[PDB]
Design a binder for these strands. Sequence first.
RNA 1: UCUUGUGACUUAACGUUAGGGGCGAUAAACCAAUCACGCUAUGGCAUAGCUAAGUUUCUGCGAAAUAUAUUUAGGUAUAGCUUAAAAAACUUUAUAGAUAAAA
Length: 197
Amino acid sequence: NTGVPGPRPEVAQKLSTEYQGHILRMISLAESASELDEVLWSSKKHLRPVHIARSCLKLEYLRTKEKGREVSEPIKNLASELENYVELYSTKFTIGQVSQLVRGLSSIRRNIQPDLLLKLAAVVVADDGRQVQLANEMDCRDLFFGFFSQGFDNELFWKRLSESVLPRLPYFNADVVSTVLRVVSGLRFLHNTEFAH
RNA sequence: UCUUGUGACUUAACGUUAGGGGCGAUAAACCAAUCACGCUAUGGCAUAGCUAAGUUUCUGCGAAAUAUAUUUAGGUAUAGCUUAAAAAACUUUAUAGAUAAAA
Ligand SMILES: [Mg+2]
Ligand SMILES: [Mg+2]
Ligand SMILES: [Mg+2]
């Protein structure tokens, strides 16, 4: 934390404490779904949108070792429990946090309720796509693949996102451009358009 | 062994002054076997935060010697001590980009 004036007060006025780092470390230290469940049970009353967003990615990391078997039972239970927090904080997420929520829940082959997806999509539909700029390159590639995997088909959502990302396409990394290209080929309403070209 | 031994002497009988007192060539001396207030009865089973003592058996539980205040310091009061696998809570501190399902 710093009090020096600067060009970006949005990312400089954020308050960072030791207690938040303590909880985030515990989540990352968990080595199994059983351990992660106990960590979340102890911290029930001290979970915030940042913690919820990070936990969803943890499920993705934990299931990578279970390459052969299907999704384990404790992983499914954690996903259901987390969704209760997502609904509670549906209007208190940032574009970066929403980006990693969808990716985490999509990697477990889980489907989000249509009402919840509509609420989360407001991050890019509101403020005429201003919040898209705040998102960095890593956030953008997860937004495209995450929402595409969820089966979310909304012309207004995809039209606004495409317009706000078009200027930055030439300067993204090659892999990120490839990810966007695959998503476009899967959506009929984006074929043979300026965005595709 | 020593002092005085006709004198401010010694002795016998009876009498006078009484304790908030008497008497005293003053030693606080004497006033019925030891007086800086006699003896006896009563108030009176005076008062003692001090010392001593406290009488048959069996079963169960079980301390303290610190703090504060005190005409208080070897007394007493208050607090402390002793008797009388539930619920709830998450604590010894700081951080990432790992998924690829469609001719
Ligand atoms: Mg004298
Ligand atoms: Mg005992
Ligand atoms: Mg006084």
